[PDB]
C-alpha cells in the first residue's frame, strides 16, 4: 500500500533491532555444514559479487519423506520447484 | 482476474469511477506520485483511497471528492418578510447539485442574496469574520462602537457636577425543572419478556 | 515591626483562554459518504444528526458569547492621544503600532507569532487541496472549522480602546463617562486605595517610571524567549487538533466488520447480508461522534468558566482597582 | 385530522429551514441547512 | 560492493518472499525491502 | 461464501484465485470450514 | 425552552426503528418467534439506552452550568443586597 | 462514597451479560466455535 507523510503501525513479522545474529563464513580448500533451523522464518543477507551461493533449501526432514522446496538462482529462468528431494549431507 | 464486464473510458477532472471493482465518486487528476510497480491502491491518513494505478495504462491519478459545502441560510421573521439569503460557507464564489433550488465574497464564505453597503451598523445576525446582516437583506460590518476621544492633558481634569441614579436589571437562573425516566416502562412496553432481557444489562 | 523603605513596580502576566476552535460537522457525509442507502438506514436512528448539529450550533454560539462578553465590555471606542506623553512611563511597547498593516502592539504580534493556529476556517481555493494534509483530509470527511466572529482586527481595536480609555481616565470611563485625567493623577488615586500616600508618587515619580520601563522591558524579553508563555492557549489548540484527528482516524475501526470501506462492503456482499455489515459501522461512527459531542461540551464547558473568570478579572483589574489579594496578580494591585 | 398546510423542503431555503425545524415559523437568524454536493454526471469503468 | 537481503516467510502454507538490493560501502541506515515472489507452498 | 456474496461475485477482481480440490466423507462436510475442530480440519486440511 | 425540546427529543427518540423491521414492540412480539425476535428486541433496547444516557449526559452538562449560574447568582445576592461591594461592574454598570 | 459506588459498579458491571449466554468469556470460548462465539464477544466488548 503506498503511504506518504503518514506514521503507520503494524504488527507483524520483523527482525528486532540490535539483535545477535550469526555470520556464517564457509570455505573451500579442496558432517559440517547442518541445515539451520527455519523457526518462524529467518532473515538472509550477502553482500558478494560473484558466483558465490544463490540459493535456499526449505523443508523439514529432508530425506524424500515429505515435501521440501529447491530455490536456485541462476542467469535465466531460474528453477523453483517443491518435491520430494533427496538432499545430501 | 476479474469478472467480465466491459471497460469505458477514462475521463478526467466529477463522475463515478470504477478501478477494479473499487466504486466512488470523485475526480481524477494527475499525481507526481513515485508509486512502485507492486502498489496498486494508494491510501491516505484517513484510510480513503487517494490514488488508484488505472488496470490498462500505467499512470496514477488522483482522486478527490467533488465540490461540497456548507449552506448557512439566513432568514429574518416569518411575520416580517420571506426573503432569504444564501451562504455557501468555506466555498468562494468562483466555485460554487444536491438541492433543486447581490453576489459577496466574505472570509467566512460566499454570501448570496445579500447586498454589501459601506455604512456600518450593529450587529444583528452573525454572519463570520466580523460581518453581519439585517432587514431588504443587506450585508454590512459590524461596528465596535460610536468613536470617542478623551481630551488628554498635562492639567486638565474633568468632574461631574451631578449625577442620574439609573437601576439596572439582571436575570441569573437558579434551577430548572425535575425529571424522573423509569427505564422498565420507557425502554419496554410493560412487556415481561421485555424486561427480562432489559434486566442483563445491569444497573443503567 | 518592619516597614519597607523602598519598593519594586513589578508587571506579572497572566494567560486566560476565550474561546476555542469551532467545529461543525455533518452526519451524512462523516458517516454515509457518497451512499445512498447508507443514509436510509441512518434516518432509522432518529434525529441524532440534528441533536449533534443543534450540540455545535450551541457551542459556537457560546463561544461567540463568551468572546463578545470578555472583550466587547465598553459602548465607545476611544482612541490613544496623538501626544505619547504620560509623565514619563512610556506605552509604545503596548500602543498599537500604525506602521505594520494590523494595529496591534509588539507584544501582540509576539503573542499572535507564538500561537499556531491549525485551522482558522478561511477560503481554500481547492488549490491545495489537491496534489502536494490532515485539514483537507478532515474537510472531506465532514468535519468543517468555522472562523469566529470578532476577527483580530476587531479583537486588537477592542483592547487599544480598554487601554486608552483606562490611560485617559482611571475607571471612571468603565462606570460612566470617561473623564479626562492625567496619568500621575491616576497613579496617585491607585496609591492611595492601597494606603499609600501621593507625596512618595510626586517625589519618585521618575523611580517608579523608570522601574515600570524595566518591566516591560523584562516582560518583552522573556515572552520573545520563554515559549511556555502561552502553553495554556497552545495545549487547548494542541488538544482540538488531537481531537478532530482522532474523529478523523476512527473512520478507518471496522468495529467487527470485515472491512471499514462501504464501497467493499456493498460491491462484496449482498444487501441481505451487508446490511448488518454497515450497522456496525454505523453504530460505532455515532458512538464516537457522541463522545466526541461529550468532550467538545466539556471543553466547552471549561471554556466559558475560563471566559467568565477572564471577564471578571477584566473589570476588576483593568475598568477599576480591587482590594482582592492575589487575584489581580501577586502583590497590591 | 386534515391536511390544511404543506411545505415543499425542495422549492427554497426558507422552507428547507422550515423543515429542518419543524416549524412554519421561523424568527430572525441563521441556520446552517444541508450541505450542498456536486452529483456525478458520467459512469468510469476501469478494467484489464 | 551490493548488499543483498533476503527474507522469506511461511505463513498460513503461503511462501513469502521479500528482497531489496541497496549499495553499501551491516552498515547504519535503513532499507526497506520490495515483495518480489509470492507461492501458496502449503509445506512445513 | 465467506466475504463474498454468491450472486455479486462477477462484478470483482482477484489477484490470485486458486481452485483446490479433494473427496472427503459425507460427514465431514461441516468440518471445512472455518474455526472448526476434529480428524479432518487438525490433520487433513484446515483454513484459517 | 432547551428543557421542553430535549423531553420532546426523549419521547420522539422511541419513534426510531435502530435497524429492525418496527419501532412498536408489541407488532416485534407478535410478528417473529423469539428464536427470530431477540435479535431485534436486543436492537432496541440498545438504541433506547444509548438515548437515554445521552439525555442523561445533556441533563448533567446542563445541571453543571446551573450550579455555577446559580453559585454566581448566590454570590452577587450576598454581595450587592446583603451589603456593599466595591467590585466594578460587579452589581451592574456604575459605582454600586 | 460516590467515587467507591462509581468503582462498585463499574467492577459490577463485568457480570452483565449484555445479550449473551453468559458473562464470563472463557465459557463462551469453550462452549462455542469463533465463528459463533465473536457474535457473542463482540456484544460483551461493546457493553464494556
Same mark, same amino acid.
Given at each position: 500500500?503506498?503511504? #506518504?507523510?503518514?506514521?503507520?503501525?503494524?504488527?507483524?513479522?520483523?527482525?528486532?533491532?540490535? #539483535?545477535?545474529?550469526?555470520?556464517?563464513?564457509?570455505?573451500?580448500?579442496?558432517?559440517?555444514?547442518?541445515?539451520?533451523?527455519?523457526?518462524?522464518?529467518?532473515?538472509?543477507?550477502?553482500?558478494?559479487?560473484?558466483?558465490?551461493?544463490?540459493?535456499?533449501?526449505?523443508?523439514?526432514?529432508?530425506?524424500?519423506?515429505?515435501? #521440501?522446496?529447491?530455490?536456485?538462482?541462476?542467469?535465466?529462468?531460474?528453477?523453483?520447484?517443491?518435491?520430494?528431494?533427496?538432499?545430501?549431507? | *482476474?476479474? &469478472?467480465?464486464?466491459?471497460?469505458?473510458?477514462?475521463?478526467?477532472?466529477?463522475?463515478?469511477?470504477?478501478?477494479?471493482?473499487?466504486?466512488?465518486?470523485?475526480?481524477?487528476?494527475?499525481?507526481?506520485?513515485?508509486?512502485?510497480?507492486?502498489?496498486?491502491?494508494?491510501?491516505?491518513?484517513?484510510?480513503?483511497?487517494?490514488? *488508484?494505478?488505472?488496470?490498462?495504462?500505467?499512470?496514477?491519478?488522483?482522486?478527490?471528492?467533488?465540490?461540497?459545502?456548507?449552506?448557512? *441560510?439566513?432568514?429574518?421573521?416569518?411575520?416580517?418578510?420571506?426573503?432569504?439569503?444564501?451562504?455557501?460557507?468555506?466555498?468562494?464564489?468562483?466555485?460554487?447539485?444536491?438541492?433543486?433550488?447581490?453576489?459577496?465574497?466574505?472570509?467566512?464564505?460566499?454570501?448570496? &442574496?445579500?447586498?454589501? *453597503?459601506?455604512?456600518?451598523?450593529?450587529?444583528?445576525?452573525?454572519?463570520?469574520?466580523?460581518?453581519?446582516?439585517?432587514?431588504?437583506?443587506?450585508?454590512?460590518?459590524?461596528?465596535?462602537?460610536?468613536?470617542?476621544?478623551?481630551?488628554?492633558?498635562?492639567?486638565?481634569?474633568?468632574?461631574?457636577?451631578?449625577?442620574?441614579?439609573?437601576?439596572?436589571?439582571?436575570?441569573?437562573?437558579?434551577?430548572?425543572?425535575?425529571?424522573?425516566?423509569?427505564?422498565?416502562?420507557?425502554?419496554?412496553?410493560?412487556?415481561?419478556?421485555?424486561?427480562?432481557?432489559?434486566?442483563?444489562? &445491569?444497573?443503567? | 515591626? @518592619?516597614?519597607?523603605?523602598?519598593?519594586?513596580?513589578?508587571?506579572?502576566?497572566?494567560?486566560?483562554?476565550?474561546?476555542?476552535?469551532?467545529?461543525?460537522?455533518?452526519?451524512?457525509?462523516?458517516?454515509?459518504?457518497?451512499?445512498?442507502?447508507?443514509?436510509?438506514?441512518?434516518?432509522? =436512528?432518529?434525529?441524532?444528526?440534528?441533536?449533534?448539529?443543534?450540540?455545535?450550533?450551541?457551542? @459556537?454560539?457560546?463561544?461567540?458569547?463568551?468572546?463578545?462578553?470578555?472583550?466587547?465590555?465598553?459602548?465607545?471606542?476611544?482612541?490613544?492621544?496623538?501626544?505619547?506623553?504620560?509623565?514619563?512611563?512610556?506605552?509604545?511597547?503596548?500602543?498599537?503600532?500604525?506602521?505594520?498593516?494590523?494595529?496591534?502592539?509588539?507584544?501582540?504580534?509576539?503573542?499572535?507569532?507564538?500561537?499556531?493556529?491549525?485551522?482558522?476556517?478561511?477560503?481554500?481555493?481547492?488549490?491545495?487541496?489537491?496534489?502536494?494534509?490532515?485539514?483537507?483530509?478532515?474537510?472531506?470527511?465532514?468535519?468543517?472549522?468555522?472562523?469566529?466572529?470578532?476577527?483580530?482586527?476587531?479583537?486588537?481595536?477592542?483592547?487599544?480602546?480598554?487601554?486608552?480609555?483606562?490611560?485617559?481616565?482611571?475607571?471612571?470611563?468603565?462606570?460612566?463617562?470617561?473623564?479626562?485625567?492625567?496619568?500621575?493623577?491616576?497613579?496617585?488615586?491607585?496609591?492611595?486605595?492601597?494606603?499609600?500616600?501621593?507625596?512618595?508618587?510626586?517625589?519618585?515619580?521618575?523611580?517608579?517610571?523608570?522601574?515600570?520601563?524595566?518591566?516591560?522591558?523584562?516582560?518583552?524579553?522573556?515572552?520573545?524567549?520563554?515559549?511556555? @508563555?502561552?502553553?495554556?492557549?497552545?495545549?487547548?489548540?494542541?488538544?482540538?487538533?488531537?481531537?478532530?484527528?482522532?474523529?478523523?482516524?476512527?473512520?478507518?475501526?471496522?468495529?467487527?466488520?470485515?472491512?471499514?470501506?462501504?464501497?467493499?462492503?456493498?460491491?462484496?456482499?449482498?444487501?441481505?447480508?451487508?446490511?448488518?455489515?454497515?450497522?456496525?459501522?454505523?453504530?460505532?461512527?455515532?458512538?464516537?461522534?457522541?463522545? =466526541?459531542?461529550?468532550?467538545?461540551?466539556?471543553?466547552?464547558?471549561?471554556?466559558?468558566?475560563?471566559?467568565?473568570? @477572564?471577564?471578571?478579572?477584566?473589570?476588576?483589574?483593568?475598568?477599576?482597582?480591587?482590594?482582592?489579594?492575589?487575584?489581580?496578580?501577586?502583590?497590591?494591585? | 385530522?386534515?391536511?390544511?398546510?404543506?411545505?415543499?423542503?425542495?422549492?427554497?431555503?426558507?422552507?428547507?429551514?422550515?423543515?429542518?425545524?419543524?416549524?412554519?415559523?421561523?424568527?430572525?437568524?441563521?441556520?446552517?441547512?444541508?450541505?450542498?454536493?456536486?452529483?456525478?454526471?458520467?459512469?468510469?469503468?476501469?478494467?484489464? | 560492493?551490493?548488499?543483498?537481503?533476503?527474507?522469506?516467510?511461511?505463513?498460513?502454507?503461503?511462501?513469502?518472499?521479500?528482497?531489496?538490493?541497496?549499495?553499501?560501502?551491516?552498515?547504519?541506515?535503513?532499507?526497506?525491502?520490495?515483495?518480489?515472489?509470492?507461492?501458496?507452498?502449503?509445506?512445513? | 461464501?465467506? !466475504?463474498?456474496?454468491?450472486?455479486?461475485?462477477?462484478?470483482?477482481?482477484?489477484?490470485?484465485?486458486?481452485?483446490?480440490?479433494?473427496?472427503?466423507?459425507?460427514?465431514?462436510?461441516?468440518?471445512?470450514?472455518? !474455526?472448526?475442530? !476434529?480428524?479432518?480440519?487438525?490433520?487433513?486440511?484446515?483454513?484459517?
Amino acid at each position: 500500500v503506498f503511504r #506518504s507523510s503518514v506514521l503507520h503501525s503494524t504488527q507483524d513479522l520483523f527482525l528486532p533491532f540490535f #539483535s545477535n545474529v550469526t555470520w556464517f563464513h564457509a570455505i573451500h580448500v579442496s558432517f559440517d555444514n547442518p541445515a539451520l533451523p527455519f523457526n518462524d522464518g529467518v532473515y538472509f543477507a550477502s553482500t558478494e559479487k560473484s558466483n558465490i551461493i544463490r540459493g535456499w533449501i526449505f523443508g523439514t526432514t529432508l530425506d524424500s519423506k515429505t515435501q #521440501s522446496l529447491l530455490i536456485v538462482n541462476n542467469a535465466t529462468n531460474v528453477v523453483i520447484k517443491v518435491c520430494e528431494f533427496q538432499f545430501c549431507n | *482476474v476479474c &469478472g467480465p464486464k466491459k471497460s469505458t473510458n477514462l475521463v478526467k477532472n466529477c463522475v463515478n469511477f470504477n478501478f477494479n471493482g473499487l466504486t466512488g465518486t470523485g475526480v481524477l487528476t494527475e499525481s507526481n506520485k513515485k508509486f512502485l510497480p507492486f502498489q496498486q491502491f494508494g491510501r491516505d491518513i484517513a484510510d480513503t483511497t487517494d490514488a *488508484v494505478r488505472d488496470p490498462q495504462t500505467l499512470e496514477i491519478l488522483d482522486i478527490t471528492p467533488c465540490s461540497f459545502g456548507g449552506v448557512s *441560510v439566513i432568514t429574518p421573521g416569518t411575520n416580517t418578510s420571506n426573503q432569504v439569503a444564501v451562504l455557501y460557507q468555506g466555498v468562494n464564489c468562483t466555485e460554487v447539485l444536491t438541492p433543486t433550488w447581490n453576489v459577496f465574497q466574505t472570509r467566512a464564505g460566499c454570501l448570496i &442574496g445579500a447586498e454589501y *453597503v459601506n455604512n456600518s451598523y450593529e450587529c444583528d445576525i452573525p454572519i463570520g469574520a466580523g460581518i453581519c446582516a439585517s432587514y431588504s437583506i443587506i450585508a454590512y460590518t459590524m461596528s465596535l462602537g460610536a468613536e470617542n476621544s478623551v481630551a488628554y492633558s498635562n492639567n486638565s481634569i474633568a468632574i461631574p457636577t451631578n449625577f442620574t441614579i439609573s437601576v439596572t436589571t439582571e436575570i441569573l437562573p437558579v434551577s430548572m425543572t425535575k425529571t424522573s425516566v423509569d427505564c422498565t416502562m420507557y425502554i419496554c412496553g410493560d412487556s415481561t419478556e421485555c424486561s427480562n432481557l432489559l434486566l442483563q444489562y &445491569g444497573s443503567f | 515591626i @518592619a516597614i519597607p523603605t523602598n519598593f519594586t513596580i513589578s508587571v506579572t502576566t497572566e494567560i486566560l483562554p476565550v474561546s476555542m476552535t469551532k467545529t461543525s460537522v455533518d452526519c451524512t457525509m462523516y458517516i454515509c459518504g457518497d451512499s445512498t442507502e447508507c443514509s436510509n438506514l441512518l434516518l432509522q =436512528y432518529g434525529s441524532f444528526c440534528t441533536q449533534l448539529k443543534r450540540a455545535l450550533t450551541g457551542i @459556537a454560539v457560546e463561544q461567540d458569547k463568551n468572546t463578545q462578553e470578555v472583550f466587547a465590555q465598553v459602548k465607545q471606542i476611544y482612541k490613544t492621544p496623538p501626544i505619547k506623553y504620560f509623565g514619563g512611563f512610556n506605552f509604545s511597547q503596548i500602543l498599537p503600532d500604525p506602521s505594520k498593516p494590523s494595529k496591534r502592539s509588539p507584544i501582540e504580534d509576539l503573542l499572535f507569532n507564538k500561537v499556531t493556529l491549525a485551522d482558522a476556517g478561511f477560503i481554500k481555493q481547492y488549490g491545495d487541496c489537491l496534489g502536494d494534509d490532515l485539514i483537507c483530509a478532515q474537510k472531506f470527511n465532514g468535519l468543517t472549522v468555522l472562523p469566529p466572529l470578532l476577527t483580530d482586527e476587531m479583537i486588537a481595536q477592542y483592547t487599544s480602546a480598554l487601554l486608552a480609555g483606562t490611560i485617559t481616565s482611571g475607571w471612571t470611563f468603565g462606570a460612566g463617562p470617561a473623564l479626562q485625567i492625567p496619568f500621575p493623577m491616576q497613579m496617585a488615586y491607585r496609591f492611595n486605595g492601597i494606603g499609600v500616600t501621593q507625596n512618595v508618587l510626586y517625589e519618585n515619580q521618575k523611580l517608579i517610571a523608570n522601574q515600570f520601563n524595566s518591566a516591560i522591558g523584562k516582560i518583552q524579553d522573556s515572552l520573545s524567549s520563554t515559549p511556555s @508563555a502561552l502553553g495554556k492557549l497552545q495545549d487547548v489548540v494542541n488538544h482540538n487538533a488531537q481531537a478532530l484527528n482522532t474523529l478523523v482516524k476512527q473512520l478507518s475501526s471496522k468495529f467487527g466488520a470485515i472491512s471499514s470501506v462501504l464501497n467493499d462492503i456493498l460491491s462484496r456482499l449482498d444487501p441481505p447480508e451487508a446490511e448488518v455489515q454497515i450497522d456496525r459501522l454505523i453504530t460505532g461512527r455515532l458512538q464516537s461522534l457522541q463522545t =466526541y459531542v461529550t468532550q467538545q461540551l466539556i471543553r466547552a464547558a471549561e471554556i466559558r468558566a475560563s471566559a467568565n473568570l @477572564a471577564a471578571t478579572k477584566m473589570s476588576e483589574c483593568v475598568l477599576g482597582q480591587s482590594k482582592r489579594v492575589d487575584f489581580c496578580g501577586k502583590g497590591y494591585h | 385530522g386534515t391536511i390544511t398546510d404543506a411545505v415543499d423542503c425542495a422549492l427554497d431555503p426558507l422552507s428547507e429551514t422550515k423543515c429542518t425545524l419543524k416549524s412554519f415559523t421561523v424568527e430572525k437568524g441563521i441556520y446552517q441547512t444541508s450541505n450542498f454536493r456536486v452529483q456525478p454526471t458520467e459512469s468510469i469503468v476501469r478494467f484489464p | 560492493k551490493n548488499l543483498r537481503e533476503f527474507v522469506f516467510k511461511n505463513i498460513d502454507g503461503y511462501f513469502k518472499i521479500y528482497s531489496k538490493h541497496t549499495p553499501i560501502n551491516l552498515p547504519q541506515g535503513f532499507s526497506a525491502l520490495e515483495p518480489l515472489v509470492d507461492l501458496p507452498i502449503g509445506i512445513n | 461464501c465467506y !466475504g463474498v456474496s454468491p450472486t455479486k461475485l462477477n462484478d470483482l477482481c482477484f489477484t490470485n484465485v486458486y481452485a483446490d480440490s479433494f473427496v472427503i466423507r459425507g460427514n465431514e462436510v461441516s468440518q471445512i470450514a472455518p !474455526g472448526q475442530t !476434529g480428524n479432518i480440519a487438525d490433520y487433513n486440511y484446515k483454513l484459517p
